[PDB]
Amino acid sequence: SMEQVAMELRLTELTRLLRSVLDQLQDKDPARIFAQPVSLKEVPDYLDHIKHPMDFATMRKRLEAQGYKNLHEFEEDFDLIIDNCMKYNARDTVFYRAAVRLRDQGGVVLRQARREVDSIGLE
C-alpha cells in the first residue's frame, strides 16, 4: 500500500537522523572505550554482572537494519552503554570516568535530536 511505503520512508528518514546522532555521540568517545562489545574472553564473568550488554558497534548494526522505530529506543541503548559501565567499573577508573563524560557531552546532542524528531515528525 501507499501508506506502508510512506511509513517506510519515515523510518528511513529517522534512520538517517539517528546515524548522524550516533556519529556525534561516538565522537565523544575518542578513546573508543565503548566502540565494541565487552569481550567475554577478557572478562569471562561479565554476564553475571550485566544482563543487557551494549556498545556502539551493536547499536550501528541495529540502526542499519532500521531496527530503531523511534528515538526512545535508540536512547535506551545509549543509556545501557553508560549505565552498564558505571555499575561494572568503580568511580576511580578510566572506564567509569569515560562514561560520565560521554553521558554529559551526549546530553547536548540528544536534546536537539529530540527537537528535530518532533519538529520534522519522524516517529
Q: H/E element string?
A: HHHHH
The number of E-state strands comes to: 0
Q: Output the CATH topology.
A: Histone Acetyltransferase, Chain A
- Provide a count of the helices: 5
The N- and C-terminal alpha carbons lie at a distance of 19 Å
CATH class: Mainly Alpha
Strand content: under 5%
- The CATH H-level superfamily is Bromodomain-like
> Oligomer, anyone?
monomer
Number of domains: 1
CATH architecture: Up-down Bundle
Please describe the biggest sheet, giving its number of strands, its sense, and whether it closes into a barrel: none
Helix content: 55-70%
Taking all Cα atoms into account, the compactness measure Rg is: 16 Å
Structural class: mainly alpha
How would you sum up the global shape?
A: elongated
Word description of this protein:
The chain is an all-alpha fold. It has a single domain (1-123), classed as Bromodomain-like (Histone Acetyltransferase, Chain A). The protein has five helices and no strands. Helix 1 (2-27) runs antiparallel to helix 3 (56-64), helix 1 (2-27) runs antiparallel to helix 5 and helix 4 runs antiparallel to helix 5 (94-120). There is a cross-link at residue 41 (Glycyl lysine isopeptide (Lys-Gly) (interchain with G-Cter in SUMO2)). Residues 9-113 form the Bromo domain.
